[PDB]
Design a binder for this molecule. Structure first.
Ligand SMILES: CCCCCCCCCCCCCCCCCC(=O)OC[C@H](COP(=O)([O-])OCC(O)COP(=O)([O-])OC[C@@H](COC(=O)CCCCCCCCCCCCCCCCC)OC(=O)CCCCCCCCCCCCCCCCC)OC(=O)CCCCCCCCCCCCCCCCC
Ligand SMILES: CCCCCCCCCCCCCCCCCC(=O)OC[C@H](COP(=O)([O-])OCC[N+](C)(C)C)OC(=O)CCCCCCCCCCCCCCCCC
Ligand SMILES: CCCCCCCCCCCCCCCCCC(=O)OC[C@H](COP(=O)([O-])OCC[N+](C)(C)C)OC(=O)CCCCCCCCCCCCCCCCC
Ligand SMILES: CCCCCCCCCCCCCCCCCC(=O)OC[C@H](COP(=O)([O-])OCC[N+](C)(C)C)OC(=O)CCCCCCCCCCCCCCCCC
Ligand SMILES: CCCCCCCCCCCCCCCCCC(=O)OC[C@H](COP(=O)(O)OCCN)OC(=O)CCCCCCCCCCCCCCCCC
Ligand SMILES: CCCCCCCCCCCCCCCCCC(=O)OC[C@H](COP(=O)(O)OCCN)OC(=O)CCCCCCCCCCCCCCCCC
Ligand code: SF4
Ligand code: SF4
Ligand code: SF4
Lengths: 318, 360, 178, 97, 80, 68, 115, 156, 56
């Protein structure tokens, strides 16, 4: 009975992300006085299928100067990690229960960067290298901050398992006590996935495309298969970690219905931000997260270390 | 990612317009100029029109001058709109480019209505203007002008006080005032540094001496101050349109001199001398007296000048085009010192460069 | 008259309220949430896009597009082989090799235009003293081979036994300006 | 309130083309459920509509034929099918059809 | 020093909130009345079985039955 | 218009409800109509292992009451 | 075994898609196509040449800050300790110690990039 | 039933995906590219037809050769054309790209991109109206609509 | 003129400035495409007397 469960978590995610591609092109277009795809289907609902079909029927290449092993293993990790990272996600019952659920996220989310590094370096191209040597700056900028924020947020939850956060927010959103962090978490999460304004690894102006200028249609889709299922995720986590929806044990179906409302609303917000602000320069991203967020995040880490101590609000374990 | 040396290798768009002009009559060479700076279309041929007018020693009629100033300002708005936006497109702000191109499309209807082409209107002939404005086109220009200052504000909200835009643009491309002249800069690049210079207010060539407007000047030389100069020029150009609309004197559109400008279609088909002049002006072309001139006009990029040499013939001898971008891009080496690769991307736009004029 | 664009007027005047206004601005992204507001407004607007195949964008009677050789109402060709549309054409796109027609009239035996050389400048229609060559509104004649853009007299008369219902109305509505 | 008014207008568009089959023939074929006054028709079959309420550019449109010269143009619809007498009007060069 | 404190507040607020909350977290535990209750709550949780102790007739203060009034109590936790 | 975005989201929103609702119902189908017990400490594993060996059928989702 | 299945199901899915990417489409190979892209013109030199970074000082201190969190993630279980006072002092010191190192890195222009 | 019939439907399927996802390349040389932007502008949105601009030739299906092609640039255009994975299409735009246009007789202009890349559709004009290029793109889409590549495969 | 007056309020507030009087798209302010015949004025030098070219 388990294999069937994967299908209800694997196929819908692929369909949902594919229909995010249309929703991106539509929401972006309307903010720009454009009608996104509305010719392929009734309203473009078939546009993602059209893009998917052509890329897998458009020749992928084996460039002479590249490295076949890493050039081919890098996209596989991107999709493998981006899809296997939905696994411990409670909605409200996760497919698998992990005692260290978020640490699974940190290692695996940080493991996705190696897709960009190996993809850029394997594809022996100068622009591909520039994209790789910007993910290192992208990750050195946010990883120190993203880990501390999650520590502070969970420190009023007690454990590390995700599913205890539902119990934590039974009566009040965890945004309200930690709305400072929720802003820093909403940017550090925007740094991962390389979503604008922190769109530097796949830079389309300073670099022609960025760590993709040598990935032809076939393997190229594998990066977009992963670059957008990772957008839905960190929105899925944020609505679980901060915008805690109603659990109501007798009504598990109500959690998912309310969960999707916020996850889409947050997902519409990454696309909304992309439509409004220009892009950072990757030094400013480094300074932004190391001169402004890191000071305050560390100061708030002390604040939440003492908060359960001078309020008698130490959360339980188990 | 720090640039130690830039070597702009222009020449990828060297069509060689200057040599092709020498084999073409003066009227035949007019569309070459619409294609040099291809974002300020009819403000190029004004430079050609003024140069040929000077040698011919004729002046256009009063109505024509106002059309050439009225449409010489729509080119300024057209060209500054792209400069603000395509500059922002490379930086990353894609949205403003889509908003203001819903206004470029509106203005290109004016070209398509005064001329027949959206972009390269061969409309401003040396002998004034080719053909009169269709009825009610001034009303459409006015209805555009009212709504426009709202459009410029909407862009002004997006990318004028953002942290991301100020940090990507301030303190970048600082050009000293002494170097701006020595490098031969002109236009907004001079005014960004602080130098007070504008040919519309120092060497007037049209009714620009009867129209009031302000020339924006920047304190620091960074790309941010010259961004504001471009946005603020749209405001002042939109102020000239109000005046040109409110005083467009009646009269003829081309000089009543059938030896330089062609006669009307009606007179061509009833009077003999008019047919002869129509026949000769379109086969040999009017002959300009021998001489040499350098006329400069304040094209949106800056000082666009044309150096026409001539002999006693209908086809010019040498037509050198002072593209304002030639000096700016040559100075790109000095701008990007101790600045990253992304900054160079943000300095290509701030010069407002098109390589049709540079390479020409 | 000049105008300062980025020059501070007077400085060194800040109190707790003014200081806290800047702190609130920097420390809660007020002027970035302000940019989001404008884009959110644009989502709730009608897009300017128009279904091209079914509604086509506006044009004007003076528009310059596909060429066309006109005829008089009787049926006689207007072109009289005066050959000053190839004198003014600044791309040498036109070629004429007229000879007498064996009924006495001065008519053309070749009027080929190379639409790949032409720049759609409109000089040929304002030079013709009989309006023999015009430029109809047909902007949509893209082809799948280079050769179909090398127009000859037979094509140019076909475009001209086709668009006269349009060409006549356009000329009739702007000849006074000309 | 006003929401009922617009939801009522939507009913007019979805149920203003003869029937369901009439809606299908235009929704997937033109992506335009709008309805406006029928100015006229060609001998080929082209139907020309106008809606003065909408904004400039979208106030005149065609619903092309399904067959012009034994071409079977139900899907392969191209702009070069408006005859000259209507090309002038459809392009907003005149007010008189 | 009033200008310096508020001048930094006007120009670099992030480095003032960090220093303010940094000192606030250090001082708050000393002033709170519940600080001493953080330790007691972590003494209440019986993670390991409470091992009984033999009676030699000289163990009066420890209870006999679990629900008797002569032992440690948590009645302060129910009302915290 | 902007409401044309809803088709993109309407059937997208369904696709993000399936992974959540399906897991809750699949658990109840496999686990005999009870939620999937979660062992985060060794104490709970001993309890599930107890129930697995308490019942004649080697499954921990069948619960024997006071009938012994 | 439930978690092993998921990743290997994902691995098979990723391999099948990429495997179908390379054998389904029609290919036509030649040297001019498989050469490096480099914006139209042939690269002047390989991309394997030494490509100096300038944020190496932040790169090193990122390690020390990465080890630094490894000493903070045990906090949720350390709060359960009976003491609650030794923990708090040894928590502020660790975070304060990191800040002073960051503050000293600030003033020495460590976080600024070599020009 | 006949095995030929199934082949054509698959042929029409692969063609359809290649028609509604026609990604050009941000390769505007000069002075037609301004009208190639207007095609991307609000009035004539290309996202309607699933047409999205991408910088890398490796991720571009069609190449819109818009603007004068000079000798200095000719080697670069062919290189970029080679990088596009097949199937690839070229849409020569404007007089300067179709033939030599206004600079047919210059010393440093290749008389039409047809001398360097094989062109599929020619869009006349100078510049072509944004509709004229859009008619070209649609007329290119109708070209893919009749390929017959899998149908001939059954005949080989 | 089809904003329903509640979205008209939302977009008006979000933008910060009233725009229903300053819309981009044009509805009925544009001059009618067809216009009545003009008669362009005849400029100077059509005097018919005392107009010898040797003077100007
Ligand atoms: C979210 C609620 C759904 C949207 C809604 O009903 O708000 C309508 C109304 C639209 O106002 P408007 O967009 O300014 O008016 C534009 C004119 O109607 C523009 O003129 P019009 O001719 O387009 O008139 C509208 C007409 C157009 O005809 C249509 O029905 C559109 C085609 C229907 C499919 C989409 O009907 C509608 O659009 C109403 C359709 C209601 C949403 C349909 C959702 C379909 C989901 C399908 C799931 C599968 O918005 C509101 O009052 C509520 C706003 C709340 C959010 C803020
Ligand atoms: C549909 C959903 C709509 C959401 C709202 C989008 C913003 C709309 C634009 C509003 C606007 O115009 O603001 C102008 C103004 C612009 O401000 P300003 O720049 O003019 O400031 C002037 C001077 N001071 C600073 C003194 C006021 O901004 C605001 O009104 C609000 C700014 C504060 C917003 C703080 C948001 C913090 C977010 C984290 C908290 C959690 C949020 C919930 C997460 C779920
Ligand atoms: C859910 C979205 C994701 C879907 C991903 C899966 C996509 C599945 C697509 C099914 C359609 C399969 C047909 C694709 C054809 C692609 C190859 C092709 O067209 O090249 C022509 C090829 C080869 O054509 P050819 O043999 O004439 O090539 C001749 C070569 N020269 C020029 C040298 C002479 O035709 C085929 O044989 C493909 C048949 C594949 C049958 C598979 C079933
Ligand atoms: C894989 C399973 C199938 C996935 C759905 C693919 C459906 C493709 C489709 O919607 O075709 C509609 C299309 C709609 O027409 P069209 O979009 O291709 O033609 C252009 C439409 N206008 C004129 C509006 C621009 O139907 C066809 O054209 C016929 C080809 C269908 C091929 C599939 C046959 C099975
Ligand atoms: C082309 C090839 C490329 C291969 C790429 C591989 C991608 C790896 C995907 C990222 C995985 C990184 C994270 C490591 C797994 C998470 C470890 C973990 O914490 O949970 C493991 C889980 C038990 O966890 P726990 O919560 O402690 O158990 C409590 C029981 N109530 O249950 C387990 O112990 C099992 C964990 C197994 C992890 C997968 C190992 C696969 C080995 C492949 C070689
Ligand atoms: C009671 C005692 C205890 C009290 C303790 C609490 C004390 C009060 C705390 C108040 C402060 C809250 C936390 C503040 C975090 C923000 C830090 C910050 O200042 O922003 C950093 C940066 C500053 O701008 P900058 O130009 O760098 O200024 C210096 C220039 N030399 O600005 C930026 O980062 C801007 C660049 C990022 C822009 C990203 C776009 C965001 C768009 C808005 C989306 C917001 C969505 C939030 C909701 C998410 C919901 C999940
Ligand atoms: S429009 Fe101009 S370039 Fe074209 S044929 Fe006529 S005169 Fe020559
Ligand atoms: S088309 Fe007109 S100008 Fe050209 S040769 Fe014929 S009559 Fe003369
Ligand atoms: S064909 Fe005309 S518009 Fe296009 S590049 Fe050449 S001159 Fe410019």
């Amino acid at each position: 009975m388990f294999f069937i469960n994967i299908l209800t978590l694997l196929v819908p995610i692929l369909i949902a992300m594919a229909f995010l591609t249309l929703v991106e092109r539509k929401i972006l277009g309307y903010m720009q006085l454009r009608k996104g795809p509305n010719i392929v289907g009734p309203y473009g609902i078939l546009q993602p299928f059209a893009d998917a079909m052509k890329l897998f029927m458009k020749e992928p290449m084996r460039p002479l100067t590249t490295s076949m092993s890493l050039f081919i293993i890098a996209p596989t990790l991107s999709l493998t990690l981006a899809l296997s990272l939905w696994v411990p996600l409670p909605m409200p019952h996760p497919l698998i229960n992990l005692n260290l659920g978020i640490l699974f996220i940190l290692a695996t989310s940080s493991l996705s960067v190696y897709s960009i590094l190996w993809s850029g370096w394997a594809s022996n191209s100068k622009y591909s290298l520039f994209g790789a040597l910007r993910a290192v700056a992208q990750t050195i900028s946010y990883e120190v901050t993203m880990a501390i924020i999650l520590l502070s947020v969970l420190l009023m939850n007690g454990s590390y398992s995700l599913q205890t956060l539902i119990t934590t927010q039974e009566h009040m959103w965890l945004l309200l006590p930690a709305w400072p962090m929720a802003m820093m978490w909403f940017i550090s999460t925007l740094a991962e996935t390389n979503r604008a304004p922190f769109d530097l690894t796949e830079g389309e102006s300073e670099l022609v495309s960025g760590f993709n200028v040598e990935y032809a249609a076939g393997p190229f889709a594998l990066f977009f298969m992963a670059e957008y299922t990772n957008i839905i995720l960190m929105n899925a986590l944020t609505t679980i970690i901060f915008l805690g929806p109603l659990y109501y044990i007798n009504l598990p179906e109500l959690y998912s219905t309310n969960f999707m409302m916020e996850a889409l609303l947050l997902s519409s917000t990454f696309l909304w931000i992309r439509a409004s602000y220009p892009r950072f320069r990757y030094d400013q991203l480094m300074h932004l997260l190391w001169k402004n967020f890191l000071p305050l995040t560390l100061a708030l880490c002390m604040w939440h270390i003492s908060l359960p101590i001078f309020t008698a609000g130490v959360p339980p374990y188990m | 990612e720090m640039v130690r040396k830039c070597d702009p290798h222009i020449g990828l768009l060297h069509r060689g317009t200057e040599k092709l002009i020498e084999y073409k009559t003066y009227l035949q060479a007019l569309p070459y100029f619409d294609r040099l700076d291809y974002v300020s279309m009819m403000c190029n041929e004004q430079a050609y029109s003024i140069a040929v007018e000077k040698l011919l020693n004729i002046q256009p009629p009063p109505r024509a001058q106002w059309i050439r100033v009225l449409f010489g300002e729509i080119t300024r708005i057209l060209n500054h709109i792209m400069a603000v936006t395509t500059h922002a497109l490379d930086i990353g702000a894609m949205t403003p480019f889509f908003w203001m191109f819903e206004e470029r499309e509106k203005m290109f209807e004016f070209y398509e209505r005064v001329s027949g082409a959206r972009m390269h209107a061969a409309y401003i002939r040396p002998g004034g203007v080719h053909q009169d404005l269709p009825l009610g086109l001034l009303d459409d220009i006015y209805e555009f002008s009212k709504n426009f200052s709202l459009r410029i504000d909407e862009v002004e909200e997006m990318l004028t006080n953002n942290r991301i835009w100020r940090n990507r643009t301030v303190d970048i491309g600082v050009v000293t005032a002494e170097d701006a002249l020595n490098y031969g800069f002109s236009g907004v690049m001079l005014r960004g540094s602080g130098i007070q210079w504008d040919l519309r207010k120092t060497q007037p060539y049209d009714v620009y001496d009867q129209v009031e407007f302000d020339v924006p000047i920047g304190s620091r030389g960074d790309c941010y101050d010259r961004y504001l100069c471009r946005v603020e020029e749209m405001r002042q150009s939109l102020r000239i349109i109000e005046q040109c609309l409110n005083k467009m004197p009646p009269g003829e559109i081309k000089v009543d001199d059938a030896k330089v400008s062609p006669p009307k279609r009606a007179e061509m088909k009833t009077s003999m001398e008019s047919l002869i002049h129509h026949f000769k002006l379109y086969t040999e072309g009017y002959q300009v007296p021998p001489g040499a001139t350098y006329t400069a006009i304040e094209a949106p990029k800056g000082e666009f000048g044309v150096y026409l040499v001539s002999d006693g013939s209908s086809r010019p001898y040498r037509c050198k085009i002072k593209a304002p971008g030639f000096a700016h891009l040559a100075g790109l080496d000095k701008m990007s010192k101790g600045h990253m690769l992304a900054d160079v991307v943000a300095i290509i736009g701030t010069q407002d460069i098109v390589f049709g004029e540079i390479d020409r | 008259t000049y105008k300062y664009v980025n020059k501070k007027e007077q400085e060194s005047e800040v109190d707790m309220k003014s200081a806290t206004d800047n702190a609130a601005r920097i420390l809660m992204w007020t002027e970035l949430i302000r940019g989001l507001g404008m884009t959110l407004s644009y989502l709730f607007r009608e897009p300017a896009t128009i279904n091209y195949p079914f509604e086509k964008g506006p044009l004007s009677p003076r528009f310059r597009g596909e060429h066309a050789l006109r005829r008089y109402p009787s049926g006689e060709e207007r072109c009289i082989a005066c050959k000053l549309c190839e004198a003014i054409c600044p791309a040498q796109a036109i070629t004429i090799e007229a000879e007498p027609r064996a009924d006495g009239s001065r008519r053309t035996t070749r009027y080929d235009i190379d639409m790949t050389k032409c720049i759609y400048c409109g000089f040929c229609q304002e030079a013709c003293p009989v309006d023999a060559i015009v430029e109809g509104p047909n902007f949509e004649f893209s082809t799948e081979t280079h050769e179909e853009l090398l127009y000859n007299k037979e094509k140019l008369l076909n475009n001209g036994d086709k668009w006269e219902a349009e060409i006549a109305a356009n000329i009739q509505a702007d000849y006074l300006y000309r | 309130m006003e929401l009922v008014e617009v939801l009522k207008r939507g009913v007019q568009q979805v149920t203003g083309h003869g029937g369901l089959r009439g809606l299908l023939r235009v929704f997937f074929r033109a992506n335009d459920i709008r309805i406006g006054t029928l100015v006229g028709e060609d001998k080929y079959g082209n139907k020309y509509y106008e809606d003065n309420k909408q904004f400039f550019g979208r106030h005149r449109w065609v619903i092309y034929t399904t067959e012009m010269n034994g071409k079977n143009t139900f899907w392969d619809v191209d702009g070069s099918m408006v005859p000259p007498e209507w090309h002038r009007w459809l392009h907003c060069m005149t007010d008189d059809p | 020093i009033s200008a310096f404190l508020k001048n930094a507040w006007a120009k670099e607020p992030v480095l003032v909130v960090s220093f303010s909350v940094w000192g606030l977290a250090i001082i708050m535990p000393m002033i709170s009345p519940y600080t001493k209750y953080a330790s007691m709550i972590n003494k209440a949780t019986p993670y390991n079985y409470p091992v009984p102790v033999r009676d030699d007739g000289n163990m009066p203060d420890v209870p006999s039955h679990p629900q008797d009034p002569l032992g440690p109590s948590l009645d302060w936790l129910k009302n915290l | 218009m902007w409401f044309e975005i809803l088709p993109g989201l309407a059937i997208m929103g369904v696709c993000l409800v399936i992974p959540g609702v399906s897991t809750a119902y699949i658990h109840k189908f496999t686990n005999g109509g009870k939620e999937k017990r979660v062992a985060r400490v060794q104490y709970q594993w001993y309890l599930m292992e107890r129930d697995r060996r308490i019942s004649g059928v080697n499954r921990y989702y069948v619960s024997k009451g006071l009938e012994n | 075994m439930n978690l092993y299945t998921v990743i290997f199901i994902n691995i098979l899915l990723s391999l099948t898609l990429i495997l179908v990417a390379f054998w389904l489409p029609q290919m036509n190979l030649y040297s001019e196509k498989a050469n490096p892209y480099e914006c139209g013109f042939d690269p002047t030199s390989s991309a394997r040449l030494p490509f100096s970074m300038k944020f190496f000082l932040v790169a090193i201190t990122f390690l020390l800050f990465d080890l630094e969190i490894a000493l903070l993630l045990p906090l949720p279980w350390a709060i359960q300790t009976i003491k609650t006072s030794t923990m708090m002092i040894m928590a502020f010191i660790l975070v304060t110690i990191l800040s002073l190192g960051l503050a000293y890195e600030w003033t020495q222009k460590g976080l600024e990039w070599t020009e | 039933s006949r095995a030929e019939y199934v082949v054509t439907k698959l042929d029409d399927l692969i063609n359809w995906a290649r028609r509604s996802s026609l990604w050009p390349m941000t390769f505007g040389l000069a002075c037609c590219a301004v009208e190639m932007m207007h095609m991307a502008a609000p009035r004539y949105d290309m996202d309607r037809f699933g047409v999205v601009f991408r910088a890398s030739p490796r991720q571009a299906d069609v190449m819109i050769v818009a603007g004068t092609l000079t000798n200095k640039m000719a080697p670069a255009l062919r290189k970029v054309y080679d990088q596009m994975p097949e199937p690839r299409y070229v849409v020569s735009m404007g007089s300067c790209a179709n033939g030599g246009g206004y600079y047919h007789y210059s010393y440093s202009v290749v008389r039409g991109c047809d001398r360097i890349v094989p062109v599929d559709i020619y869009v006349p004009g100078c510049p072509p109206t944004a509709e004229a290029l859009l008619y070209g793109i649609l007329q290119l889409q109708r070209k893919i609509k009749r390929e017959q590549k899998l149908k001939i495969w059954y005949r080989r | 003129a089809s904003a329903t007056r509640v979205i008209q309020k939302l977009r008006n507030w979000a933008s910060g400035q009233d725009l229903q009087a300053k819309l981009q798209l044009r509805y009925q302010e544009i001059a009618k495409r067809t216009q009545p015949p003009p008669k362009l004025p005849v400029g100077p030098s059509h005097k018919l007397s005392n107009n010898y070219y040797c003077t100007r």
